[PDB]
């Protein structure tokens, strides 16, 4: 019974680490693109 219970409640350490790494990279990509998008509209001032 103890063997049966563990199949549906325990963590698989081999798979979770990859998801952690992927999410960490995506966060940095998003932050950089956000800074770029914020900086974009500055070019209108030269027309004045």
């Amino acid at each position: 019974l103890s063997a049966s219970r563990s199949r549906i409640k325990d963590t698989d350490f081999a798979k979770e680490t990859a998801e952690l790494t992927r999410t960490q990279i995506l966060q940095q990509a998003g932050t950089a693109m956000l800074a770029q998008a914020n900086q974009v509209p500055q070019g209108v001032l030269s027309l004045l």
């Binding site: 019974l1 063997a3 049966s4 199949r7 549906i8």
Partner: protein
């Protein structure tokens, strides 16, 4: 096609889980039958005398 592939993968995961549960059920049944057999063996040995 991407949505269909998503359906396929998400079904596959819970399919894996169901197969594991079937394995567990079979194991438990075999575990009980072993002890039944041992008791029968003992009774036969006692009855030979």
């Amino acid at each position: 096609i991407s949505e269909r592939f998503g359906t396929q993968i998400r079904g596959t995961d819970v399919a894996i889980r169901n197969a594991n549960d079937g394995i567990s059920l079979a194991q438990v049944a075999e575990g009980s039958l072993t002890e039944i057999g041992n008791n029968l063996q003992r009774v036969r040995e006692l009855s030979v005398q």
